[PDB]
Amino acid sequence: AALALL
Amino acid sequence: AALALL
Amino acid sequence: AALALL
Amino acid sequence: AALALL
Amino acid sequence: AALALL
Amino acid sequence: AALALL
Amino acid sequence: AALALL
Amino acid sequence: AALALL
Amino acid sequence: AALALL
Amino acid sequence: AALALL
Amino acid sequence: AALALL
Amino acid sequence: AALALL
């Protein structure tokens, strides 16, 4: 699982 | 902006 | 099981 | 935003 | 089962 | 907006 | 804008 | 499953 | 933002 | 099991 | 900005 | 598992 905030 | 993979 | 908040 | 898998 | 809020 | 699968 | 896949 | 906010 | 796997 | 806060 | 992998 | 803040 992965999560990115940009 | 955001992206999640699960 | 999995849960994401974004 | 949210996502659940169960 | 799955649930998404967006 | 929302989506459920069960 | 948003996109969900489940 | 995947969710994107942009 | 948060993610749980169980 | 795993939990991430970001 | 942030990114998590778990 | 990995987490980056930038």
Taking the C-alpha atoms of residue J1 and residue G3, their distance in angstroms, rounded to an integer, is: 27
Tokens at residue J5, please? 């806060």
**Rounded to a whole number, what is the distance in Å from the CA of E2 to chain F's nearest CA?**
5
Tokens at residue H6, please? 């942009």
Helix (H) or strand (E) holding L6: none
Annotated resolution, angstroms: 1.1
C-beta of residue G6 within 8 angstroms of C-beta of residue E4: yes
Nearest to D5 by CA among G4, G3, L5: G4
Q: Report helix, strand and coil shares of chain E as percent, to nearest 5.
A: 0, 65, 35
First to last CA, chain C: 17
Instruction: With CB atoms and an 8 Å threshold, state whether I2 touches J1.
Output: no
Way the structure was solved: X-ray
CA dihedral for C6, K1, B4, J1, sign (positive or negative): negative
**Rounded to a whole number, what is the distance in Å from the CA of L6 to chain J's nearest CA?**
11
Taking the C-alpha atoms of residue D1 and residue B4, their distance in angstroms, rounded to an integer, is: 10
CB neighbours of C1 closer than 8 A, spacing ≥ 6? D4, D5, D6, I5, I6
Instruction: With CB atoms and an 8 Å threshold, state whether K6 touches I1.
Output: no
